[PDB]
Amino acid sequence: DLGTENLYFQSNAMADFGISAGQFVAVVWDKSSPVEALKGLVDKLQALTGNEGRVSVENIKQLLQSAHKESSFDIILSGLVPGSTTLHSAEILAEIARILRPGGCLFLKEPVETAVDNNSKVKTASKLCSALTLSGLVEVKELQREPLTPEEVQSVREHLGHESDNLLFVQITGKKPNFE
Ligand SMILES: [Hg+2]
């Protein structure tokens, strides 16, 4: 759909997410991910990575149990299926770090609060960055900030049971270091 087309073109055919021929990529989705957007994105990733690469598609609630090989992914994309509104727990970030290879990169999108609210599980941008660091990632950087569309606002209501006036999307990246 249009959301996925926008994602594809604006990221240089996903080159800006490190997607290219031969890359091993995992795409993490959840029930907030529109099915057509997920299928559309997977189709594009399969075309880009080709026969020598790999696209593994994982629901966030199945990721831990899927028990992928340690250090087997070049790129992991999470929360990025257009329309998704997904929160990433410390446990999920740690598992992502485990299955990335050293030098592998996570690109993550998560709706965050502009200010701290201890009544909701939504984080701030700062706390989310620290979560990536504690999971073991390095070169942790914020790449983009976006407002939510009305549908994504509804999605946060429906799927995260949360209502706020400071909900922005942040896109963050982090890299797995070699073991020390
Ligand atoms: Hg990268």
From Swiss-Prot:
Tissue: Ubiquitously expressed. Highly expressed in heart, liver and pancreas.
Region (N-terminal SAM-like domain), start-end ranges: 19-180
Any GO BP annotation: apoptotic process
Positions carrying Phosphothreonine: 149
Record's keyword terms, sorted: 2Fe-2S, 4Fe-4S, Apoptosis, Cytoplasm, Iron, Iron-sulfur, Metal-binding, Mitochondrion, Nucleus, Phosphoprotein
Coiled coil: none
Lyase found in the keyword field: no
Protein purpose: Component of the cytosolic iron-sulfur (Fe-S) protein assembly (CIA) machinery required for the maturation of extramitochondrial Fe-S proteins. Part of an electron transfer chain functioning in an early step of cytosolic Fe-S biogenesis, facilitating the de novo assembly of a [4Fe-4S] cluster on the scaffold complex NUBP1-NUBP2. Electrons are transferred to CIAPIN1 from NADPH via the FAD- and FMN-containing protein NDOR1.
Annotated protein name in UniProt: Anamorsin
Species for this entry: Homo sapiens (Human)
Lineage of producing organism: Eukaryota, Metazoa, Chordata, Craniata, Vertebrata
Shown residues within the full chain: 1 to 167 of 312
